[PDB]
Structures are given as C-alpha cells and as structure tokens.
C-alpha cells in the first residue's frame, strides 16, 4: 500500500505537464519545467521559480470493511529571485500552484503492481492547509511554505 | 488567487492616502508617506513614526459550495522615536492605525488576472486581535506589535475548468 | 481606541492621590509619591516602597453593533527594603494597592481627542488575577507581581 | 486584605505550638522549635528536622455579592539528616505535618487592621495537593516538597467606601 | 497519613517473600533477594536481576465524610546482565513483577503508630500503567521502566 | 503476561518466513534472511533492505472482569541503500511491510510458560498509525519510521491464585 513516492511523482508530473509553455491565461508562471522531488533542500537549484515537493508524515484510520483512509501531507516550497519583486512574484507563484492543485480534477496516479504493469487510479481529495512565507533574512532569495494534505484509498482490502 | 500581497499593498495604500496631510480631525500623524511592505526589518528606516506591514501565515477551510474561507494574518509593526514621549505618541499612532483600519469602510483590491487587467474585488471582513508593546530596552526607540486578521473570499476558481 | 497609556497614567494618578499622606485609616503607606510609568525596570529607583505599572498584552473581541470590548493587562511590581520585614511590608503594600484597585469606584480617565480637548470618560470593570512574589534571592530588596485586567469600551463605534 | 503573610505566620505558630514537647501520642518529631518563614532557602539552617513554609503564587475569582474567593499556595519543604533512615523519618515528619494540617480545628489569624488592633479571623478550608519527595543525590540530606492550598474569604472591603 | 516509605517497604517485602527460592513455576526468577529501596540510582548493584523501587509523586482527593484517597506512584526499575538475551530476560523479569503485583490479593501492610505498636492494614488497589524499555545504548546492561499506582485510605478521618 | 519480546520475535519470524524467495507475485523484496530484534541502532547492519523491529513504551487499562487490555507499540525503522532510487525502493519496502501488517492473517505467539512448554496464542488486532521517513541528509542511505500498535489480551492470571 502507501504508494507515497507515487503521490509525489504524480503531483510533480501533473504540475509540469499543466505549466509547461501552454495556456497562458489562468496560469502565469511560464515554467519551461523545473519541478521535481529528487533534488531539494537548497543546495543545487541553480535555476529559479523552482518548486520542490517534500514528503512528510501521514496518518491512517481503519474502517471495518477493509477500506483504508490515509491522510498524507506534502510540504511544498517555492524559491524566487527579484525578477520584478520578491513578495509580488512569490504570491504570483503560490497563486499559480494553488490554482493548478485545485481547479483541475483529481490526480492521475501511477501505482506499480508487483512484477506486473501500472494500474492507473485516482486520489480522493485535496485540502490545502496553512501557507507560510519567508522572513526578511536572505533578501536576494525567497521561500514559500505550503502545507497540502492528500487522502487516498489504496487499491486493497483487509481480510 | 490568494491576493495576499495585493491585500497588503491595497491596505498600505489606503493607510498612506488616508493619513497624509488631510482631515486632521480624528486623524493626526501627517505622514508625508512612509508605510510600505517593501522595506522593513530595522536596517534602513532613517525616517520614523514608520509603521510597517509584514506578511504572515494563512489558514484555510472548505465550504461545500465551491467557496473557500481563508484567514490572512498581517502582523504589522510600529516604530517610533522619543519625541515628547514614546508611550503617548506610540499609543496615539496605533490608535490612528486602528481607527483607519476600522472606521473607514472596507478594503479595496487591485488584483491582477493572469496576463490581463486589474479587476477590483473586495475583502469580506477584518478583525484586529491582540496588540502588544515593547519593553524598556532601546529607550529612544520603541516597538508596538499589533496583529490583524483578514477574512477574504478568493475568486471561486472552481466550476470553471 | 487603544488609548492605553491613558489607562496607565489614570491608574498611576488614582493611586497617587488616593494613597498620598491622607486618610491614615484604610490606607497606610504614606507614599509622598513615587508611582509612575515612565521609569521602571530596576536600574535607577533610589527610592523604595516604589510601585511601578507595566504595559502588557491586550485582547479585543467584536460585538455586532459597533461595540468594542478590549481586554487589557497591566502587570504591577512593588520594590521594598527592610523597614520591619520584607514579607510583612511587601504584603501590606500589595494589600493597599489591591484595596485602591477594588474599593473605590471606576477610573477617572483622561482620554485625548485628536486636535481637541480631553473628554473625561470611564472604565467599566477591573479583575485582579494571580498575585506572585519573588524568591529568596536578592535579600535586601523584594518583588511582588500583580496581574490586573482593565475592561473598557473605547468611545467610538464602527460603520 | 490578602492576609497571606498572616496566614503563613499563624500556620507556623500553630505548628510550633502543636509540635513542641507536648502530646507525645499522635505526634512524633519533638520540635523544640525550629519552623519559621523568616530564614529559609538552604543556607544557614544549622538545625534539622527543619520544615520551612514558602509563600507563593495565588489565584482569585469574583462573585457577584462583593465576596472574593482567594486560592493561596503555600509550598512546604522539609529537611532531614540520616539518624537511622532518610525515608522512614521523612515519612514520619510529613505524616505529622499532614495530621497537624488536617485533624486540628481550623486556621486562626492575627491580621492587623489599618493603624489599629488585631481582630482574629479564620480560614474557610484547607486542601493539600501533591507531596513530592527528593531523589538520592545529597545522600545525608533530603527534601520532600508539600504543596498545600487554602481558601480564605478576605474581609469584604467593598460596599463601605 | 502519607505512609509512603511503608508502602515501599511493604512492596519490597512482598516481592522478597514471593520470589525467593520457592513457588517456582508461578513466576520465573530464582531471585534469592535483591529488591530494596535504600540502595538505587545505578551505582552499587554488583549483582544483577536487581529490581529497584522508587518513591514518587502522589496526589490526594478529599471526600466529604472524613474519607481520604491518595493516588500514589511507585516507579520500578529492573536491571539484567544477559546470560541469554537482553529483551528475552527483560520481558521475563517484567512478566514476573507484573504477576507478583497482580495475582495475589491486596498488600499486607506494616504502618507504625505513634510511640506504639504496628497496626497491620490494607491497601485498596493497584493499577500498573505504561511500561517502558531502554535504548540500545548500554548493551551489556539493561533497563525497563515500570509505572504503578497504589490506592490507599490512611487509617484516619478529619474533624 | 507482557509477551513483548515474544510478540516481536513472532512478528519478525513471520516477516522473514514470508519475504524469502517465495510468492513473487504481490510480494517482492526477496529478503534472503536478515531482519531481527537482536541487532539494531545503525552500527553493524552491513546488509541493507534491512528493517528493524524495536520495542517501545506500552499502555494499559483494566476492565472489571479480570481481562487486561495492553496497548503495545513497536517502532519500526527501514534502512535502504541506493539501487535504482532511494524513494522508490523505500516506498516499496514500506508498502511490503504494511501489507504484511494488514493482508496476512493474525499474529501468532510462541510464549513459554514458567519453567514449562510453549503453548501458542494469538494477538487480537493490529493498527498501524503514523509512519514517517527521513530527509535529504545521508543521501546514499535512508530512513523510514513505522509506528505499529498491537492490542493483545494477556492470559488472565487472576481468579486462579
């Protein structure tokens, strides 16, 4: 079950394919594509407007029919330079990412069955929690903290 | 969406346009114009009676009709020199800040649609929560932390995919 | 609104004129007058029995008719030498200050209108919370914390 | 009003009068007389079987008849020096202090009116909270914290201005 | 009242009489005798299978009939020195101690009257709450925290 | 009672017997044999895809019929080296552990009676609570914490003294 890096990769792929050089209205970042999950922390990232996805703690609760609900959290960070203005561009980026999370359907989902093929599925819901922002320190750079929760039912049932 | 920084910019513009060299009754600081969000912290600020607006964490919940309720927290700080007295001038400056934050209408918006023009919008309600004051240290200067919350309805960018 | 240094100065003035060299009954500290708000901390204060008023966190809540009720906090400190005994004199100090808090009316108050004159007003109610003291350290001196709350409605209404 | 120092003084006087070489039954410490609130901390105190009553933070609430309920906290500390066992004698002394605080009447006062005489008053009730015990370190010495709280009705110095 | 070191000594005597060289099969420890309250911390204890009793914080409640209830806590520690496996022998010891606490009756008790004789009494109930285990550090030795509560009404009533 | 080490040993025995070179469908990490409670921490463990079962604090309550409810916690940690990807391999291993927790039967015991034989018993239910992983530091290595709770009814060694 779990399928956590699957969630992360699905979100990254969705964001990349919905932001890359298309639909200039309703989306304003013009990312050639930089979003990923392998490279983060701060070191590396020599390119900017770069958005990284973290993978955090998840909590599960049991239903008495084999059903599984798994509340899982993806911390999100955004780094910006003074293209125009740090606060302005940062809010532009966070509005863009929140829009791409909310306005479009549910995530395509790319589980890997043991010694088989991928059975595409979906993720139930999205809830976006508190949104934070960097402080005055580190003036030329910027940070934007996003807390989003995902809940999915893994394609299995108990005994 | 979000409109955060747009909210802060509209609020600071309202402050500047409302407490500058006009209507000296019920409002007296005669700021040539100082308040902004671009420059803050403490370094710089050669001018005083300088009130600054910061950007804080949001909080959100979903209502089952496409509308989402979000609380914006704007911790705004007050800096002032000695003059006649730190306490009296500080409190009356924050009193002016609160009377302009409450008495005069609601907010305005100058939000920008993606690669388009700015369509005005509105902020639903504003509540000013706990307000603090600094201590004796740094005597000729002084801090005055006042925390405000903004309840705004973002444009419902659902049902239109 | 706010109007807090006026609250502090009103409390200081009330204590001073209600405790200075008059009514030997009820009150006895014979404070010729030391109480203030400009000078505190500990450094300076060469005179004793001195009582100082602090400035604390405020709290506000809204009523849906323009009415504003503002919870306020004034920590109070008292510093004493050995006239007879630290505990005894510090304690009848805190007793006298609590009595001047409680027994006499509401505040006579000195709010200041912008570019106008003072419209004397009233403060609704006062609640005295925990009263603390110091530790055995600093034997020749003494400290005693007082936590009071000023509950007032600012003389203004919303739109 | 408050009277917390007078409460401490009356309680220590009761301890001294009720432990000193009298009532050999039901009471076993034979304090010739040691207990006080004047000298405490640890430094000094060349005598032992010593018990010291600290006077601490309080709590209060308001009732709509002029009467005020005050919760006073009196941290009580005890000390011992071997002479058979730390644990047995510490238990013995804390048991004696607990039976004094419990089974013997109510609490007397010796409060002083403004520039007048002393009119006796009483404490409404006593309640004893957790009683801690120190650890092994400082082997020949020992501590056992006793947290007691009293509820007293102070003289209702309202309605008579 | 209080009667705390008497609780500790009664527990120690009970464990000694129900562990030593007799009643095997009921519980497993062939402990000749090591349990005590005078010697603890870690230093001393040259021998192993040591079990120690601590004396901890108690809480009391007052009933409006002179009745007295006292919620008292006795942390318990057990030490071991292999001869097989740390986890195996440690759970062996904790099972032994939980059995000796639970299976047999209430506590026989040896409270001491003022300048008189001992009036044996009873302890109402025992509840054993969370049981802990040490960390991998200090491999040749072992630790396991035992937390129990004893309920006793002291043989006296109020006025 | 307790059974903590016995529960852990039976759990890890089920892990090793179910992971090794069999049923490649639905289950693939191919632990030849490795995981146990004897060796853990980090020092040693030259072999990876290694998962450790620790023994943690428990919780208990009493019900008025002699039966004891004991809530026991097993912190489980996952270690993995880079083969194709740290994230993919760590996720798949934790998924395999979780499906061992869920889809396979109940938990067996091998508890030994005092100076007697081993009569097997069962575990009531398994609940797997929050599970977490490490961060970027120690890049070629990885950590994945698993917190699992086991509810067991210990043999009612009451009413038969």
Residue numbers in the entry:
A (entry chain B), C (entry chain F), E (entry chain D): 1 to 159
B (entry chain A), D (entry chain E), F (entry chain C): 1 to 161
Task: Provide the authors' original text about this structure.
Bacteriophage T5, a representative member of the T5-like family of siphophages, serves as an excellent model for studying the assembly, infection, cell wall perforation, and DNA ejection mechanisms of this phage family. In this study, we used cryo-electron microscopy (cryo-EM) to determine the structures of mature T5 (a laboratory-adapted, fiberless T5 mutant) and urea-treated empty T5 (lacking the tip complex) at near-atomic resolutions. The T5 head comprises 775 copies of MCP gp8, arranged into 11 pentons and 120 hexons, forming an icosahedral shell with a triangle number (T) of 13. The T5 tail, which comprises 40 trimeric rings of the TTP and a distal tip complex, is connected to a unique five-fold vertex of the head by the connector complex.
We built atomic models for the portal, adaptor, and tail terminator of urea-treated empty T5. In contrast to the mature T5, the DNA and TMP are ejected in urea-treated empty T5, resulting in an empty head and an unoccupied tail tube. The tail terminator comprises six copies of protein p142. Each p142 contains two α-helices and a β-barrel structure facing the lumen of the tube, which are homologous to the terminator proteins of other phages, such as Lambda (gpU) and SPP1 (gp17). Structural comparisons of the portal, adaptor, and tail terminator proteins before and after DNA release indicated that no discernible conformational changes had occurred in these regions during infection. In the mature state, the negative electrostatic potential inside the connector channel and TMP collectively prevent the release of DNA. In the DNA-ejected state, once the interaction of the tail tip complex or baseplate with the host cell induces the release of TMP, the large space of the connector complex enables the passage of DNA. Therefore, the connector complex may not be directly involved in the aforementioned processes. Notably, the tip complex of the empty particle became detached for urea-treatment-induced reasons.
